[PDB]
Amino acid sequence: GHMSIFTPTNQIRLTNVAVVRMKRAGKRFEIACYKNKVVGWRSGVEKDLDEVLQTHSVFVNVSKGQVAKKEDLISAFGTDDQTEICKQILTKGEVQVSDKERHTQLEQMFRDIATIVADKCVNPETKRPYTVILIERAMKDIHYSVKTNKSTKQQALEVIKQLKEKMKIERAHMRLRFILPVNEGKKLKEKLKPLIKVIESEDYGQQLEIVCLIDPGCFREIDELIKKETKGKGSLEVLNLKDVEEGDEKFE
């Protein structure tokens, strides 16, 4: 980065690779995957785990220039499958968690995650939730560099508590499900579905239970239509039990 100007976008090219490497106790494993949200697979935001692999060559040490072939990885790691090795390097290595700016802890990248958490929380009387700086000031205060190696499905509870530790936010993003019969269901299902604001939790039996709820920051933008689309038709129930049958997540 910040060296060559010629950087054309392509699917499988060494010009579109992301730097990621795993540091072992007595060995190094540096690889190159697609820069298109390479860490997406660790959160279920990917499309596959094949095309994301730009190169099948792993470096044992870029300083010396030791390129490990299929025989090398089979000896060093013990497996001939690069997918397994690369997968480990991606979840236990120095992966570029850059979603926008292709740099480290700079370029205001700390404000990026702050923008996502902003709409997810409600601030008390002082300004509107659009003030990313307001939440960012408290976010980076308790835990600096919250974007660096941010473990999504692992430190989810920690991150939300770290924020509350400093600034006590008012509620957060919850889940609600509407309950109405087939007759009334055949009205909101043709309005809320095309908008694509629903969650993978619906009922297709006698009651069309639909779980639709976005970030509280934009609650006024979603409820403005929900108030008449389903609220002024069926009953609105809250979804707080994740240890029970939610409904249907697939028609198969």
Side-chain angles (χ1 to χ4, degrees):
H2 57 81
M3 192 65 58
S4 186
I5 54 165
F6 207 77
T7 339
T9 33
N10 206 324
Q11 289 202 32
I12 315 163
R13 284 298 181 258
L14 291 169
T15 24
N16 287 265
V17 297
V19 184
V20 48
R21 53 182 173 209
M22 176 162 62
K23 306 288 180 63
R24 302 293 272 166
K27 209 87 267 182
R28 305 297 184 238
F29 286 100
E30 317 186 71
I31 54 175
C33 309
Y34 207 6
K35 69 185 207 302
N36 192 87
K37 211 186 181 77
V38 61
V39 76
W41 72 270
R42 206 44 165 124
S43 310
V45 208
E46 78 308 314
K47 47 180 268 287
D48 70 270
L49 43 109
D50 196 308
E51 305 193 287
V52 192
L53 270 301
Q54 295 293 272
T55 189
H56 51 73
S57 343
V58 56
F59 278 75
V60 193
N61 188 271
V62 75
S63 333
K64 189 184 298 298
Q66 219 306 90
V67 192
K69 61 201 75 74
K70 59 204 207 311
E71 279 65 57
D72 290 302
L73 45 96
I74 226 291
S75 312
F77 194 87
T79 317
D80 62 276
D81 173 64
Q82 256 288 33
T83 336
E84 254 291 78
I85 313 175
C86 294
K87 180 163 56 61
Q88 298 216 334
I89 300 169
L90 253 297
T91 188
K92 298 297 295 181
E94 317 173 330
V95 55
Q96 296 325 279
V97 286
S98 324
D99 279 288
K100 184 174 180 279
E101 299 314 316
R102 314 96 214 217
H103 294 279
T104 348
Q105 236 292 145
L106 213 76
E107 313 289 9
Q108 282 284 329
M109 196 70 206
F110 39 87
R111 217 190 61 134
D112 170 69
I113 183 65
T115 307
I116 309 168
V117 71
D119 274 281
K120 222 162 293 304
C121 323
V122 180
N123 64 271
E125 48 150 294
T126 204
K127 221 154 292 308
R128 278 180 150 126
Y130 96 108
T131 325
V132 177
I133 306 299
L134 181 69
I135 198 162
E136 111 105 301
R137 266 289 283 205
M139 193 96 168
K140 70 137 70 75
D141 183 60
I142 292 295
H143 193 291
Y144 192 64
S145 304
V146 249
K147 226 298 174 182
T148 325
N149 55 266
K150 175 214 164 191
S151 314
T152 39
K153 304 202 300 156
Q154 192 161 31
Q155 256 56 87
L157 273 303
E158 281 71 69
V159 174
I160 198 70
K161 293 298 173 65
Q162 281 160 30
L163 182 72
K164 264 172 57 63
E165 192 69 39
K166 220 295 204 307
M167 184 173 67
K168 292 93 190 88
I169 50 162
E170 287 283 84
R171 265 66 184 276
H173 167 72
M174 261 69 200
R175 289 181 169 206
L176 268 88
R177 63 199 286 134
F178 315 113
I179 315 165
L180 37 280
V182 180
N183 189 326
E184 291 289 58
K186 197 63 177 56
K187 276 123 202 71
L188 48 133
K189 208 201 88 164
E190 31 210 75
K191 290 299 296 298
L192 309 180
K193 275 298 214 189
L195 291 179
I196 315 291
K197 321 251 229 198
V198 297
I199 304 170
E200 326 92 279
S201 205
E202 290 164 40
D203 196 311
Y204 300 109
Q206 276 56 80
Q207 37 273 145
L208 193 85
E209 289 197 278
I210 296 186
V211 185
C212 194
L213 220 285
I214 204 147
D215 275 336
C218 303
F219 94 100
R220 195 123 177 113
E221 187 222 76
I222 183 73
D223 194 72
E224 60 176 75
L225 59 116
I226 297 298
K227 65 157 67 190
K228 50 100 185 176
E229 227 70 298
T230 170
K231 270 170 59 175
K233 179 168 281 301
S235 311
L236 59 143
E237 184 59 287
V238 293
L239 177 66
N240 75 328
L241 236 295
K242 270 288 298 185
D243 198 53
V244 77
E245 207 50 274
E246 296 173 74
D248 258 300
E249 58 165 292
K250 232 148 292 308
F251 215 74
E252 293 217 279

